[PDB]
Amino acid sequence: SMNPPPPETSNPNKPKRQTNQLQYLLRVVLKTLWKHQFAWPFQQPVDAVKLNLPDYYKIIKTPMDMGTIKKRLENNYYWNAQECIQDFNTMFTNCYIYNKPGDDIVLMAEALEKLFLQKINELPTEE
Ligand SMILES: O=c1cc(N2CCOCC2)oc2c(-c3cccc4c3sc3ccccc34)cccc12
Numbered sequence: 001s002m003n004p005p006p007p008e009t010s011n012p013n014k015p016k017r018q019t020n021q022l023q024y025l026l027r028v029v030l031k032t033l034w035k036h037q038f039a040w041p042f043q044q045p046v047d048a049v050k051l052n053l054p055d056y057y058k059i060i061k062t063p064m065d066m067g068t069i070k071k072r073l074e075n076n077y078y079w080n081a082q083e084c085i086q087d088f089n090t091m092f093t094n095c096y097i098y099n100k101p102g103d104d105i106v107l108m109a110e111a112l113e114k115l116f117l118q119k120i121n122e123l124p125t126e127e
């Protein structure tokens with residue numbers, strides 16, 4: 001089953017702005033998760049061809065990954081922190097929906113999510 005185009009990271013018709021929270025999401029949150037030992041599966045879109053998961057896009061209708069998020073942050077795609085936090089949450093929940101509890105990929109997602117929650121609890125107030 002072929003992979004879809006990845007989620008867009010540019011769109012001149014979409015509104016965007018810089019906020020101190022979005023800066024924090026890039027410089028602190030993404031940076032911290034990206035370097036984790038278990039980050040590598042989440043640094044690019046799921047490749048359902050390489051992994052022989054022909055049902056992946058029958059089950060996961062909103063794919064998301066940190067490569068995409070990183071590009072969205074670096075390219076000033078977002079309007080607010082909520083848009084970016086939603087992408088992270090979609091990434092994690094996709095993994096929990098598709099896989100069995102306790103599978104390695106779920107444990108890896110859970111480790112990143114634990115760090116994510118700590119950093120989101122520490123989200124700065126809007127300037
Ligand atoms: O929900 C997911 C489910 C699964 N799998 C099902 C269980 O068996 C391992 C693959 O994998 C992933 C992966 C992932 C795991 C292992 C290798 C690779 C990926 S994504 C990718 C892209 C290019 C090359 C290799 C890999 C990442 C995020 C979510 C899932």
Ligand SMILES: [Cl-]
Pocket residue numbers: 001002003004057
């Ligand atoms: Cl497909």
Ligand SMILES: [Cl-]
Pocket residue numbers: 001002003004049
């Ligand atoms: Cl493909």
Ligand SMILES: [Cl-]
Pocket residue numbers: 037
């Ligand atoms: Cl470690």
